[PDB]
Design a protein around this ligand. Structure first.
Ligand code: F3F
Ligand code: F3F
Lengths: 306, 306
């Protein structure tokens, strides 16, 4: 029993974190086989950020412009290229600790673990959701760029995020491991700001199923609803519209608890309209949206507390 | 910026998790040097739990009664002893992945990271506080016994918890790595239940300092309070009494923000009496108590957003 925001064990990722220095700038890189990945803005100094031309800034660099440190070991750069917003440094050593891995581009609403790192040293791990507005509410200080997000599937690390910047509201933006940004953000200091966010409906529903699996039914009701009628209430409360695809995804959870998706939607609608009446769900006083249907099946018992 | 329940990177602990089987019971053990630690109740079958005599149950076991699996490798038991509520199995191999470590007994209110494990395979990591009532609100399913709690200090792993059982309210109980229980709990199936809990005052205060360090001051006020006057409000709201020691501990945070501890206490008192007025603190609608003063200094910027 219980329910917590759980991260994946971070060991396989810890063994891949290095430090990358270019001139006066240091940040984290990711060492897989004989390549180190890092934010290209490592090449930018104390004025470049405002309007950098990375093509131009990089052509002026040599292989020995870059200092890569794996622990106390110094790695030798023997090549470099730019891939979108990432630098790809080739090194003379292959990381013996490289896990089985892939690079994936995660969709909004999906969750992953972040290994916060400073000077190539892991300092903490926590679970994040990719917001509908393509930001994450992380916990990052100066020096955290190059910290990565990931999921672990059996023995395979699916890397899906690399940290690049903080936006004015204190939220965070970055790229996939191909260097393409999530959201309309760019790696330069501009007026860019997070667009308006919405609550992740599908995740709230999954979480309500987790609460039932864990034995709680107080918020249920005898009503049902249609998709369209639900979505009118959804938009009033700034929730993402529910789609048939989302209903389909909730099938396994619906089957395990014997509660129809649209009946759970009627429950949510009531909770949204009436509030929670001083009561809690899975220890929370608010409706949580950073657990996916996958996260619930992963964490919750396969048998429900009927 | 941002503020999240952050766990320590779990790598050093992952490399220490093994599987221990006795008869039909399997759970997790901790492999440090040539010793495996695990809950002694691994020796108990499908009726022993009710009223087991561990001395008697253990004397009937040989070294080969115990099956220890580190990955796919089988470790050979070459000795065993009981230490309080733990078994101490000596093995023919020394764990090459043993980190620098110590065993510590944590105090109520303090926090640590839990590596949830099943069949000796780490599955997740999350941050927990030791409640005043000596339980933790973990996330555990059948097979999680032997999962450990820890803090990491530089290169040193301070182990402080091993999981033994779930109590009726769904909360969790276990021991330090000397096998002594936290709380009045025992490793047998009885009517034992968590005593009444209280909110960890010192942690709520630390967290209010974190909110200020991160730039938020809305909840402050022009009032001050005495310890005694605060504690009268504290007991009305089921908060731990504040002591001079707790005030002393909050010194560094108080200095960084320029807010007197007793002035922060007046703020808390107002928040307790008036509520939060639909507003949030560090993204929370409630007063959080699972971050210590240490956790705040670790996670927050050393310079405040004045
Ligand atoms: O702490 C951070 S994140 C960070 N700051 N430095 C690093 C390093 F690259 F790792 F060194 N990482 C921070 C502070 C301020 C900002 C910013 C910003 C910003 C806001 C709006 C538009 C463009 C840029 O990020
Ligand atoms: O899922 C768990 S924790 C757990 N259950 N099994 C293991 C194993 F040892 F790892 F195998 N760990 C569970 C379910 C039910 C209980 C219990 C209980 C209990 C409640 C009151 C008094 C004494 C015992 O714990």
């Amino acid at each position: 029993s219980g329910f917590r925001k759980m991260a994946f064990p971070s060991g396989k990722v810890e063994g891949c974190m290095v430090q990358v220095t270019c001139g006066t700038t240091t940040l984290n890189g990711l060492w897989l086989d004989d390549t180190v990945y890092c934010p290209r803005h490592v090449i930018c100094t104390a004025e470049d950020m405002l309007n950098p031309n990375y093509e131009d800034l990089l052509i002026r660099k040599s292989n020995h412009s870059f200092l890569v440190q794996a622990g106390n070991v110094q790695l030798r750069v023997i090549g470099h290229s730019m891939q979108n917003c990432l630098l790809r440094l080739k090194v003379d050593t292959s990381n013996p600790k490289t896990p089985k891995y892939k690079f994936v581009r995660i969709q909004p609403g999906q969750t992953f673990s972040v290994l916060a790192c400073y000077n190539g040293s892991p300092s903490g791990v926590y679970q994040c959701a990719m917001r509908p507005n393509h930001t994450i509410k992380g916990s990052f200080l100066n020096g955290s760029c190059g910290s990565v997000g990931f999921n672990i599937d059996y023995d395979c690390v699916s890397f899906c995020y690399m940290h690049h910047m903080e936006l004015p509201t204190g939220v965070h933006a970055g790229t996939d491991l191909e260097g393409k940004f999530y959201g309309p953000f760019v790696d330069r200091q501009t007026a860019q700001a997070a667009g308006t966010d919405t609550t992740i409906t599908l995740n709230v529903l999954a979480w309500l199923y987790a609460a039932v699996i864990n034995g709680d039914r107080w918020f249920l009701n005898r009503f049902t609803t249609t998709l369209n009628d639900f979505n009118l209430v959804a938009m009033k409360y700034n929730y993402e519209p529910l789609t048939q695809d989302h209903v389909d995804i909730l099938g396994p959870l619906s089957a395990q608890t014997g509660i129809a998706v649209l009946d759970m939607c009627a429950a949510l609608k009531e909770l949204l309209q009436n509030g929670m009446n001083g009561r809690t769900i899975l220890g929370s006083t608010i409706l949580e949206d950073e657990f996916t249907p996958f996260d619930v099946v992963r964490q919750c018992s396969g048998v429900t507390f009927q």
